[PDB]
Structures are given as C-alpha cells and as structure tokens.
From a paper:
It contains an N-­terminal DUF2063 domain (residues 10–92) that has recently been classified as a new Pfam family, PF09836, which is currently comprised of 216 proteins from 173 species (170 from proteobacteria and one each from acidobacteria, bacteroidetes and planctomycetes). The crystal structure of a member of this family, NGO1945 from Neisseria gonorrhoeae, has been determined and reveals that the N-terminal DUF2063 domain is likely to be a DNA-binding domain. In conjunction with the rest of the protein, NGO1945 is likely to be involved in transcriptional regulation, which is consistent with genomic neighborhood analysis.
The crystal structure of NGO1945 was determined to 2.10 Å resolution using the MAD method. No electron density was observed for residues 1–30 and 231–248, even though LC-MS confirmed their presence in the purified protein before crystallization. Thus, they are either disordered in the crystal (note that there is sufficient space in the lattice to accommodate the disordered residues) or the protein may have undergone limited proteolysis in the crystallization drop. Analytical size-exclusion chromatography in combination with static light scattering (SEC/SLS) revealed the oligomeric form in solution to be a dimer, but with medium confidence (∼30% was clearly dimeric, ∼50% was interchanging between monomer and dimer and ∼20% was likely to be monomeric, suggesting that at any given time the dimer:monomer ratio was ∼60:40). An ∼20-residue loop (residues 117–137) connects the N-terminal domain to the remainder of the protein and could facilitate movement of the N-terminal and C-terminal domains with respect to each other. The surface-exposed aromatic residues Tyr34, Phe45, Trp62 and Phe80 in the monomer, which are mostly hidden in an N-terminal dimer, could play a role in base-stacking interactions with DNA if the functional form of the protein requires dissociation into monomers, but this is only speculation at this point.
Residue numbers in the entry:
A (entry chain A), B (entry chain A): 31 to 230
Write the structure that this text describes.
Amino acid sequence: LNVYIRLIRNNIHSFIDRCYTETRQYFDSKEWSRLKEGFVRDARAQTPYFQEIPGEFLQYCQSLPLSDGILALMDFEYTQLLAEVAQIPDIPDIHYSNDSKYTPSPAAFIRQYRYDVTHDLQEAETALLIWRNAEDDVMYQTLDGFDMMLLEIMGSSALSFDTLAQTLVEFMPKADNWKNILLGKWSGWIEQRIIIPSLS
Amino acid sequence: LNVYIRLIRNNIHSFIDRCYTETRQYFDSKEWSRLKEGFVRDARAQTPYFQEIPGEFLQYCQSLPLSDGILALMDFEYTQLLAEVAQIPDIPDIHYSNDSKYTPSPAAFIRQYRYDVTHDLQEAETALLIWRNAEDDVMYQTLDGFDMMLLEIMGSSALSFDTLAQTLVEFMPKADNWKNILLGKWSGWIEQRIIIPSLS
Ligand SMILES: [Cl-]
Ligand SMILES: [Cl-]
Ligand SMILES: [Cl-]
Ligand SMILES: [Cl-]
C-alpha cells in the first residue's frame, strides 16, 4: 500500500464527507468511518476518475444496502452536486419572444422519493426539482404534477410558450385567464434558470 | 301598483340582500337601495320566476355597469348560491373501483376572475373551484392549472382513475411514484364531493 494509494484514499474520505454532509449526520463517527473503510476496500473505489467517487459511494451504499430513507437522502445530496457541476450552455443576452423555444437547464433534475429527504426522512411521497439558478446557487423546490409533466415533455422536445399555451387550449375553459397565470409561471422558470433558450 | 306587486318587490329586495351579502358591504345604505330600486323598475325584475331574481340582478348590474371588481364579486356570490341549490344525483353506497368512471359534481363550478373575490378585490388573476361537499356545505378553493384541466376534461367525458393515470403515463417520468400522489388527490376529490360516480 504505497504513498499514492494512501493519498487518494484520504482524498476519497474527504470528498465523501463533503458531498454527503446531511447523510453523515444520521451516523456515528465510528459507523460513518466503517462505511468509508468498506468503500475504499471495494472495487468501485478503484476508479481512476476522482469525479466518479461520490456516485460510486452511493452505489456501494445501495448494494449494502443502507435503509431506504438514507438511500433517498444520499441520492438527493448527489443530485445537488450534479446541479452544482452541470455545464449550462452560454446564452446570448438578446430578446427571446414567446415564439422562441425553451428546453430545461441541463442543471435541472426531477426527483421522486418515498421519503422526505428535505426534512427528516418521513415516509411520504416527495416530488422535487433540483437546479442551479442565475446566481449559480443550487436550489430545490416541491414539484406539483402539472410542472413535472411540462418539464418532462419539454425535456423530450424544446417548446415555445406559444406552442405550450396553444396545445392546452383544448383541455381548458373557454375563458383564457389561465394563459396569463401560465405565462407568469413560465416567466418565473426563466428567471430562476429552470428553463433556458434552446439554441441551435 | 297593487298589493301583490308591492309584496314581490319586497321579496326581491330581501332575496338580493341575502344572496349578495359581501357585495352589499362595498356600498352605502342609500347606494345599495338605489341599485335595487333601479332593478325593480327594470324589465329584468318582471320575471314570473322568483328563482331567476339573483341572476337577473347580476345582469342588471353588468349592464349599468358596476366596477369590474364588484361584478366579479357578484358572480362569485351567485356561484355559491348555484352550488347551494344544485341537484346532485343520489349515489348508491356501494364499492366503486378505480375502474369506475367519475364525473364532476353538478354542484361544482370553475371560476376565473381578474380580481381577488375571496379577499378584497385585488387586481390579481384568481382561479377558484366552488362546490358543495358531502356535509352539504358550500366550499371554495384555489384551483391550480392541472386540476382545472382535469375537471374540465372530466366534464367533457366521464373518466376512471385507471384511464386518467394511464393517459398521463407518457407525459411523466418512468418512475411511477406520481401515480400514488395522484390517487391521493383523486381520493380527496371523492371525499370532498368534487367528483361523483358517473351512474348510467
Ligand atoms: Cl481517485
Ligand atoms: Cl425512495
Ligand atoms: Cl318574483
Ligand atoms: Cl373578472
């Protein structure tokens, strides 16, 4: 066990502690070290790519397996790092009309947990949107069913507000006040950097 | 002007005061009486059907016209009476599976106002569902876009939960946790008497 192997094992421990700060609190000092000592001795920790360590530790933990509540909390935490690190294309600062197509940010993720990963692992169906906003801060928020559907559909094929609003016209009341509420929601997703212009 | 015409005019005044209790508070004693004296002298108040009086007073007011905020508040108030008075078919108390079709209650109404009719007539797009619940009490609640769409679609053609959930499968993530959240929402609409079995 050479000086290099000892260095990378210490960098593994340190990186895991940094990525899984909430999860770490559900364990004892000794329990947490045991988890890590096991990972480091496992084949998944032999990756030559340091970037792959947090994700391999999550898969190590899912194979043990840790409880379902801890596993959901670990996935949530990993997803935050995925949003922190996601590459979001440069967007020219010009005028984009409601005829211009949008796509969700590559730094935006839809998660479904059977536990309340935002609070204290309550058994309760939880639906969250994790993303990075215009100020480069990781944010999460509860996602309702309409929103989840739209983001998922939008992930399938870039969409303009005009196209969105026109498709829904047939499944909505004749009075078009909803189009104004919707545009408000859509505009808020642009400000928060949940959706970005789809630039070809 | 005979004793009968005087009796029905007093019953008109009294009925309007009862149906438009919130609206009445935005006016003075004299202002409110003037509105009513005008209605009573108008052709709309010559209806032989006493049930049609609250609705004819609303149309009288829309033709004057009263402000847009008062008119929205009047429509809201009238809608409550429509829910109070709606005839809801008798539903046998048997087992209805998620293969059984539902329809919205005939006592359930979808309203869109440019004013906050639930508070103090704020210029703000407001979307409400007004209905009568299992305890025969009139209820109202904010309606989000997914819900509005489903109720409107359901008003077009009776739908089962199995049919609903299967149609949405293609516009949702592969992980089916949302189906459990949805069933929860659907079950809550049955308890509150927003949707009722569609019995042929
Ligand atoms: Cl490494
Ligand atoms: Cl889960
Ligand atoms: Cl009458
Ligand atoms: Cl209005």
